[PDB]
């Protein structure tokens, strides 16, 4: 519309703004003052129609976002780069007989040692710039400015948790879709059939069986067997919310919950699995709209002409931009009746959060300091534990 | 108010306005020592001292 | 030389690696793991053929590498730039010619002199950046990483010291070859002749001799003479190592009256005293492999297009590059039969090492710390003392 | 027809069969027409009176080098920091040069493992008693075999420490560290010159070009003369002692013979090219007389195996076996003593014995782990023809 | 000469030549200890003592 | 005829015939055409002034090596433990290898007896008094015969020891002990080189392949320089004393000539090659010109007979004797003693005399037992042409 | 192992690792 | 002899003698004490001091 209001014309006069004094190397020095009227507009009180509108409160809403897999996180010393692991293969006890060659007492019997070698993690970073002169214009107390400087920092702590939780639930779906053997994969037909298969596959763990681990794709576990058991204190179902609302809605969940394990807290579920994307073709960055889209989510370091390798992850919705279409797929389970039952010790996850406040660079030209947050996180998944995937594929 | 760990590096201690060092002061006294022609009715000249430099 | 071994194909996959995690803005963020098999490889053992091999031991050999010139170092103040020295040139007495007119008394005969204006030295610089992200992917003990961070720092001073002796050596040799008189040079023919011409070049430095110095290269001394002696507690002989070895094993060990005439207390010696290069013709930098060759010796700051002035000094073997041939000549004697017998206190050498360890710059974007080392070193040779060169 | 020719009466026949003659009647000794002839009394048994056991303990001359490592893990690594010269400051460049990176670069070399070596010996309690006439001689025998098993460990660890130095001189250490002498007179001046040359700051004289990352850049080092050893034959050290040093007036201070290690020959240790299999039993009975109780007629010998005894004269080893020996007789290999590394492992080296009480024959074993390598990051000059 | 505020943050104490530590070195001696073949005339080897080379 | 040619008036006619002249009337001494002619008096008996007994007492040069035994028993043995070099641990051998026996192996050279020597001398009482104008001269003769027999023992024993060392140097040691020289300025750098070889761990310098259980295998040993002796001629020691020591300035370290046993001539002894029998009477007279009173015609000389005198010029001994000596005077046998087994038994030595009163000549005997052997278990280098 | 002047400026303390104080929020 | 005055301001004392103050010969040694070649014989180097020579 259009407004011929005496106060709205004063409001919309942008040549008087504070931004004019900070986007020009020479600017206005002394203030004459302004006539402020609250008549026949908003901000109008019944008494004293000539005062400036005043703030009752300003409220920093700071939500503590949590990583649900944080109790799995071991902490290492960030030294070397290859973590390896190994088991001892089964040798079943044999009957003894007193009528043998009796120089087989001299014979040897070594253990057999299935292993697997893991690479490194990656170091991740994020920064935030806080200045000292222009952000003071909009808090009216020192306490609100310090709460702002602290809320920015705790948001930078919280989105690390969001990143790591979304990253690990992308790992556990990428694993089961692509890398997992089709011996651990059971196939369902309908939702009640899948519920009965999930509830019999929980009970297919806690059993001394060499059938449910992928020790055959360890380095030395191709011949022989390796028997794994799993308690119920370390079994986790990873599924969707539309299917957790059906698994918990059965009488078997009630008899698990009564006098026993908390079955609500062993079923880790999400809305539908995957907001994380993968790169399949090594592309480059060509357009400014994609650069600004990456700047919106805090990715400051990437510029035009940067190449993205095959297998890089993004952790937000990227596939709508012109040069990402086709080059980028999604870690999303096919035929969303989906449940992946694992032992929680299979997630080999360790970090290094020792010294993640690197000391600030001041930049006293603009008086805008910058704090960086560096952390090393190693995400892997071990083959020596019971895993079952129940899909319709 | 918001508790956290506000003992922080330079901006955490900069919003409570770090120590006032220089005062940009008048002590080279302007309009009470200078801007005067209130010297009056004397005997003669040359008390004028030409002091050396640093 | 083609290998189809599966562990060698696992090692040959450069897509899985620490490098493409640290080259790109985005990378893979989890590891599924790889089947490592030690069978039919270099890493194979008998009982367990499936683990990754182990380091127990990681050494860091270190050596301190002293200077052999820093008794000559005068700790200056590093203020002002132009230093000067002079002598008063010799005026011989003349005969009393009484037939000249008597107003010869009123004419003034000012004492003439010979100066030499030197100038500034060189502020020299080196730095090293230690990483906190990818250096820690090596060094399986934290003690090994701290030993590394210290050994780099202690190597920087070692190749300050060897650089300063290379520059003192090259200063003396380049001053022997390009500046001198016709009087100062001698021609030896062999190793047995030079070891006696050195002995008879001493006993010539300590005569009243208007030759043997280079005041004709001083500012006022182009016409006139200047006499100087030495004291034999001030004479330095700069030879190669073959000559000092020959003296000590042959000439001393084949004489009986060695109790008086041993001059090897005054002899510094070098194994090969040409390795340092100069510039002629004033080129510039245009080739990529040349600056990649320069980066290996620590010189980080040179880009392409940078020009090199007509007197710069390179201090390592540099004449093989594509740009530098014809422009760069080596400071060396052409015979390996060499002796420069000069006076000490003809070699001024003032370095300044006070504000030297400058405070570091933590670079937390890349999580790294750069340390700098700065020193100001002035080195020069005075033209007012006795010098004799013996070469071919 | 004699008494001594009948072996059906000997002490072996009682210990060759599961049943034997359980009482003695006597055996009618006379020494007529035998080796044991005596002029007066023809019927007495010969009397021995002495039994002596020459026993010598043997050293190593490389035992101060022998460090005691821990023996866990396999590979050992070794590295330096390459040189990086100070550069001139110019104040005309851009100021974003300050946030640029100058990483330190290095040069490594990776070392493998050592070898676990082994020797056994069995001591009897029922047949060994028949060969001695007092128990002090039997305990001397049982102690002398043990001291001999220590002494030949020492001899072996001397032989395959001089052999590795000769092998590193002849097959590694590229030509720029090899100096050529012409006679025995000029070599003793080349050594005196090289001792002075190894004490200057120089990027030469080491083998960082033999290292992993030292192909580009330079690396300088020195020596001390409390760290320099000269490895010669005995025809050179005897020459230095009798002819050169004795014909010097004024030799005080220039004799370097407190850093010269000499040997009889520098080759008695053999290698293998063209790997083979043990196919002749007449050579395995040659191997048995040096202590090898393992070998049989199917065992292959790889392309780096060493022997430390003259095996090249046999009908099977010819054409395969090369000797680690200087071809010159004018050999002076000047080292830095830090370039050697020789670390042992001698902790659990006396094994608990296996007693075997059916024959009452205890058996002792000895196991030591020894690592031998040479660093390329130190100063070395070889002088040959 | 005029003191004013001479005690200053970084540069007022930098023209006053901050701190002479780390003098360049000849405690790694050369030509008095190395470049040397003036050793004793005495009876025999073992002077060497190969040291471990961590630092 | 002339009086001095008439044997019928001699003293021997009174002492070979059983009945002779009881009285005498004198004779008719005249020296007119004899050798005893004096110008003035032709009828006086020739007078003799003096009879000087030249008697030199002679030494042994091997008395310190003689340890005294008890002369009991007859055999003594010496053995060593052979080398057992450490072998690599094979982990693919059968697991029952630990039960297999590995006995240590000996060498065991066995030494027999010494031989008892004997010499006698007769002192007459009735015919010896016809010489020796005083009785003091007769007692000096009776003492000089005895002190010549003791000197004969010493010279015989020294010559037999030297003969044993040269006989061991030839035809008993190995191929790797013989070093070849060519001159006399040579074999003095090779002797100085060779000492200081005997002090290295090496199995080349001993003779354990002449022992019993040491035919295949090696045995390493070392020497100490307080046990190394050098057996040369006087020519080589003369060269060392007048050129090598005299023309060198720093002789205070390398003058090894306090370890040199040098001899005048290194051969006077003979070994039988082929056994024979004695048939000639002039050979008997030549044998008993040296004191061999035992042997008559028809006696057997065995193969291991050592003569001690030059007996090669006889009818019987041609082609049988050997003359063990170095050939061409360039000879230096560098022992390591503890090798020379040398034992002597001289307590029942001066036997009681036999008086024989019918001819009234007393007869003395001297017996002494002596054992001379040489051990193969010590380091030895022989340098010859 | 060898110290010399080991605890030097910021990087020689940065490998002698520093201040595990802030960890991630859930556990 | 011819005494008379023997006083003019100059040429009386100048014909007698002016007083010696400078004597121009060997106090800075040459070929007797210095011009040395007879120095020591021992361990070797670094007695070569370097002065400021500003006077």
TrEMBL record, chain B:
What protein is this chain from?
Uncharacterized protein
Native organism is Staphylococcus phage P68
UniProtKB/TrEMBL annotation, chains D, F:
Report the protein name in the record. Major head protein
Q: Which organism is it from?
A: Staphylococcus phage P68
Question: In which domain of life is the source organism classified?
Answer: Viruses
From TrEMBL, chains E, H:
Q: Which domain of life is it from?
A: Viruses
Write the protein's name: Uncharacterized protein
């Amino acid at each position: 519309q259009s407004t011929k209001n005496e106060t709205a014309l004063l409001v919309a006069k942008s040549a008087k703004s504070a931004l004019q004094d900070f986007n020009h190397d020479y600017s206005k020095s002394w203030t004459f003052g302004d006539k402020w009227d609250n008549s026949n507009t908003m901000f109008e009180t019944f008494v004293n129609k000539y005062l400036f509108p005043k703030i009752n409160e300003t409220l920093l809403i700071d939500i503590a976002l949590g990583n649900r897999f944080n109790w799995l996180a071991k902490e290492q010393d960030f030294i070397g780069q290859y973590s390896e692991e190994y088991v001892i293969m089964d040798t079943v006890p044999i009957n003894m007989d007193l009528s043998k060659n009796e120089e087989l007492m001299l014979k040897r019997n070594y253990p057999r040692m299935a292993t697997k070698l893991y690479g490194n993690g990656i170091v991740k970073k994020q920064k935030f710039t806080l200045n000292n002169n222009d952000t003071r214009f909009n808090f009216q107390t020192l306490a609100d400015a310090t709460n702002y400087a602290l809320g920015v920092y705790k948001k930078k702590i919280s989105d690390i948790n969001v990143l790591e939780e979304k990253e690990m639930r992308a790992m556990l779906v990428d694993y089961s879709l692509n890398q997992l053997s089709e011996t651990n994969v059971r196939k369902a037909t309908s939702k009640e059939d899948l519920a009965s298969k999930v509830f019999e596959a929980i009970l297919n763990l806690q059993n001394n069986s060499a059938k449910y681990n992928e020790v055959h794709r360890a380095s030395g576990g191709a011949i022989g067997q390796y028997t794994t058991v799993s308690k119920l204190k370390d079994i986790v179902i990873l599924t969707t919310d539309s299917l957790k609302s059906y698994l918990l809605d059965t009488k078997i969940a009630n008899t698990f919950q009564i006098a026993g394990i908390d079955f609500t807290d062993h079923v880790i579920s999400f809305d539908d699995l995957g907001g994380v994307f993968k790169v399949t073709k090594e592309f480059k960055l060509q357009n400014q709209d994609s650069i600004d889209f990456l700047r919106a989510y805090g990715d400051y370091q990437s510029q035009l002409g940067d190449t993205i390798p095959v297998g890089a992850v993004f952790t937000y919705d990227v596939s709508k931009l012109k040069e990402f279409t086709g080059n980028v797929e999604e870690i999303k389970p096919k035929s969303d009746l989906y449940a992946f039952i694992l032992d929680i010790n299979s997630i080999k996850y360790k970090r290094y959060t020792k010294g993640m406040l690197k000391p600030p660079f001041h930049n006293p030209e603009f008086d805008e300091v910058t704090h960086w947050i560096h952390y090393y996180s190693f995400k892997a998944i071990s083959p020596f534990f019971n895993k079952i995937l129940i899909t319709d594929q | 108010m918001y508790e956290g760990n506000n003992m922080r590096s330079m901006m955490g201690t900069s919003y409570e306005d770090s120590r006032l060092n220089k005062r940009t002061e008048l002590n080279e006294n302007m309009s009470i020592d200078t801007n005067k022609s209130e010297d009056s009715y004397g005997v003669q000249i040359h008390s004028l001292s030409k002091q050396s430099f640093t």
